[PDB]
Design a protein around this nucleic acid. Structure first.
Lengths: 94, 271, 46
RNA sequence: GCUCGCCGGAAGACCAAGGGUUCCUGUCCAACGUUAAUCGGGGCAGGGUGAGUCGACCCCUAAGGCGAGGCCGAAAGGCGUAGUCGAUGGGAAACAGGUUAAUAUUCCUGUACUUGGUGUUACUGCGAAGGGGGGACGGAGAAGGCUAUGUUGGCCGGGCGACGGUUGUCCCGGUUUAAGCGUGUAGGCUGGUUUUCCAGGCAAAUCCGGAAAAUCAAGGCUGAGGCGUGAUGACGAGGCACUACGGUGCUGAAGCAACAAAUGCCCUGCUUCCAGGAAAAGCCUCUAAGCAUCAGGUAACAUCAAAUCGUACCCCAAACCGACACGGUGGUCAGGUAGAGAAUACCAAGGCGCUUGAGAGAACUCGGGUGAAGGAACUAGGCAAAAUGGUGCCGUAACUUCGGGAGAAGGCACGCUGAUAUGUAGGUGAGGUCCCUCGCGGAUGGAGCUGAAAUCAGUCGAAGAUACCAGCUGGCUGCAACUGUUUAUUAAAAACACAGCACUGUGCAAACACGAAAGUGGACGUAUACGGUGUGACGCCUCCCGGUGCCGGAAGGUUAAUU
RNA sequence: AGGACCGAACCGACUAAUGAAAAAUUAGCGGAUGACUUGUGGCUGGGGGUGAAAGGCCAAUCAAACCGGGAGAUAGCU
């Protein structure tokens, strides 16, 4: 049982990319940016409540931040957690 | 028996094996085993405290019974076994009550021989009893110095002690060194000589053998530079000084016993 | 030719890392000194 | 794109460590790239790392670390008990195919497995900080059984030749398929089952150990591979539709047999040797306190569960350690022909041509090739080159510690073809036939397959161990017995070490060593042991105690604090 | 059987000629079941360690490491 408030905080965004699109189309799997602390179960819960859609399974991974250079000064982008969430057969997501 | 090995290579030429067939060809009694890791002759500070120790073969520790307290229960000798931890051979015995122990194998002992500890026990080889009960003139081994402690004198492959006298609460032992020593007469002792008496006839026959026995090589002080040893330095081979340890103390002759607490027990020093 | 530095992360950490430094008084002192100096990377710790 | 060349026990493929975006795409060429650069491991932007079963975490411990109390220490702190950490070791579980520009045992497809809860009905002794078993272990050697893998034939598809021949004993390609489940084999280990008692296993034990007694000779454990299923599937040479020339979608034959065969597996086995070969948990089992008709245990079945972190890419290197796009770096994989071979040569798969080129064809330098006659005359020195170089057989001195010396020396044979023998000796081994406690069984049987070595006869060349590969040999002699070690980076030796020898200390709270100490090593050793010193295999051997040391003595002389 | 023999890997470094290289190269060379070699982790600390002993090695540094401090040591010398 995850708290409503917690759930709302978990899910950061949808991730747009070719791969993501492919996943959505073929495998019925949505690619989300989620909180770095968000566990799989929590993510699933969030998905179910907040998008109103049955979840088969969630795979997560941590994306490491790229090191960049703004002019002369070096600086690193933040790490962030990506989640492939596979929706059950016949579940169409808006 | 001793066996001079045929010189099919140098390093085998001068080898003499001591091959006893009556030893157990097999894995030892595992309950009585325990771990025994190597020091490298280095103490808790991590410094080398005794030179020339290092390496050699992994060895288990056989838990030998030197206290020898199963009084009245007769044991029977199951087998003789190789112990890597000592010059003697050990013997796995089986008490009538079902317990097993390792003991130093004495001279005549073999599989099937019955042995017994206690005041009542028969004065025969391998039997153990207090030195007030043991007849004067007898050869004993595995001799306790303090009653109850465990055998400390005469444990090595072909050693034994003579009980020369029993004067009241003490008995006088003629130790293998030639030292005559008073010992409390209630101290325990095992009848006969300890076993593996042709141990001294073995000759390693190569450098490697020594190494296998965990003995690193020994450099001569005279081969060193003066900063290292008192004997060091000299152009060519010089040695114009009285022999001494690496720490400057005389080596040829200078006595080093300082124990004034046990001077009373020493009847006569060895010669 | 086998050069002197042959990196190993665990070894580095155990040797020089924060916790090791903390463990002893001299280590602590070193840390303090570093802090005083204004070091950004107080220890080898990543 | 087509040729050419190089690596191929790597200059290929996959990891660890280390790095940390170098990966992929688009875009830009100032700088960086030893030249140019449209290219890049460079700049900028975007994308990319998907796990119950791989690894970490986790449970367990080794060396070792920390260490409540504690012992010790001016202080700081040292050592260490209980404990708790610490892998490089022990501990549950996944395979095949398909897919991305870039991930995959992680996605998808198929087919699996594991150990937890929870609930069940069925049963009914459960229970640990404890007991026992197990885990649990060395070197070498030898086979035998296997597979990986390869070769040939069969089969299936395609081919009929840019130049003489090529419908055949011809040419090219393919002929692949897992874990799991079932079977429990080659083979290895052990005698089982029941009963009774017992000073043992810190207490108890129905467990282990020990005693008896009965009765049956098969009982159990282990075990590669094969076979079956998994699989009416998947993959499949290439054909056929579309084409953003990147590829996408459909389709799909055969898919067998024999022989050879590992250093891999059975094997943590067996045999043997002495130098005598981790630990703890998981796992099995036994009970105690306990609880007692409850919990807990095992039984299947249902359901839920398996979080977290790593996953790109380089990894003998242009990405790690070397200031550089410059030598070092642990593991795994190991095709063909020749060969003893992981050597060597040429190749496969795959990967590269080393980020300045173009000419010229002087001296001189580097790295190679050949050289008349002579053959060490060179030189400090045959330094360097040259030479020797294989298998089999014959043959082989002094001296010797009887092992050696010895590959001593020195010689002969060596290709190809045919025959012996349309392929032998051997190896393997199908049908058939017989037996049978019935199976992965035993006999007999020899088809097919594979296959040296030799002899005889012929034959070609200047030359047959034809290339690469691959000892120079002998004689006298110093030193050190020997194998070893050493001045990282001018010294590898006659130096150090060595087995052996001798002296000497040391009686165990050992001498000695590290420690203001506690303590630790010596050693869980005990004089056939340990320390120190010298000598240095083996053989034959090996006067002086005045000096300086050490050992013993203590009559006298001298002699501190103290008084 | 073997600190046995010939010989790749692997470990080394006797001879030779020659910055890519602050010790390498190519050609030969020694050991190659052991007193072998190697990965990972651990321990020993500066008059201290370790040393089959060369004053060797202890982070390209060694007859006393490096870093900071006493410290602007002292310098009848340049």
């Amino acid at each position: 049982m995850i708290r409503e408030e917690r759930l709302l905080k978990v899910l950061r965004a949808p991730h747009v990319s070719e791969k993501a699109s492919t996943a959505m189309e073929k495998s019925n799997t949505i690619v989300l940016k989620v909180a770095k602390d968000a566990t799989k179960a929590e993510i699933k819960a969030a998905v179910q409540k907040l998008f109103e859609v049955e979840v088969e399974v969630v795979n997560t991974l941590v994306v490491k931040g790229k090191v960049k250079r703004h002019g002369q000064r070096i600086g690193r982008r933040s790490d962030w957690k990506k989640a492939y969430v596979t929706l059950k057969e016949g579940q169409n997501l808006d | 028996a001793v066996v001079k090995c045929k010189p099919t290579s140098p390093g085998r030429r001068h080898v003499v094996k001591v091959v006893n067939p009556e030893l157990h060809k097999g894995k030892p009694f595992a309950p009585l085993l325990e771990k025994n890791s190597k020091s490298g002759g280095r103490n808790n500070n991590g410094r080398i405290t005794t030179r020339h120790i290092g390496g050699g073969h992994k060895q288990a520790y056989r838990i030998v019974d030197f206290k020898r307290n199963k009084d009245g229960i007769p044991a029977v000798v199951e087998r003789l076994e190789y112990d890597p931890n000592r010059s003697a051979n050990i013997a796995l015995v089986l008490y009538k009550d079902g317990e097993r122990r390792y003991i130093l194998a004495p001279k005549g002992l073999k599989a099937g021989d019955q042995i017994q500890s206690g005041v009542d026990a028969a004065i025969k080889p391998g039997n153990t009893l207090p030195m007030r009960n043991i007849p004067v003139g007898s050869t004993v081994h595995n001799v306790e110095m303090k009653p109850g402690k465990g055998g400390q004198l005469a444990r090595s492959a072909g050693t034994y002690v003579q009980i020369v006298a029993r004067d009241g609460a003490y008995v006088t032992l003629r130790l293998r060194s030639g030292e005559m020593r008073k010992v409390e007469a209630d101290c325990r002792a095992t009848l006969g000589e300890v076993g593996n008496a042709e141990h001294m006839l073995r000759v390693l026959g190569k450098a490697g053998a020594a190494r296998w026995r965990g003995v690193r090589p020994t450099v001569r002080g005279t081969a060193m530079n003066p900063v290292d040893h008192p004997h060091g330095g000299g152009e060519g081979r010089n040695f114009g000084k009285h022999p001494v340890t690496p720490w400057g103390v005389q080596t040829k002759g200078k006595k080093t016993r300082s124990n004034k607490r046990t001077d009373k027990f020493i009847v006569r020093r060895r010669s | 030719m086998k050069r002197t530095f042959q990196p190993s992360v665990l070894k580095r950490n155990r040797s020089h890392g924060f916790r090791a430094r903390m463990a002893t008084k001299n280590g602590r002192q070193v840390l303090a000194r570093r802090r005083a100096k204004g070091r950004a990377r107080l220890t080898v710790s990543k």
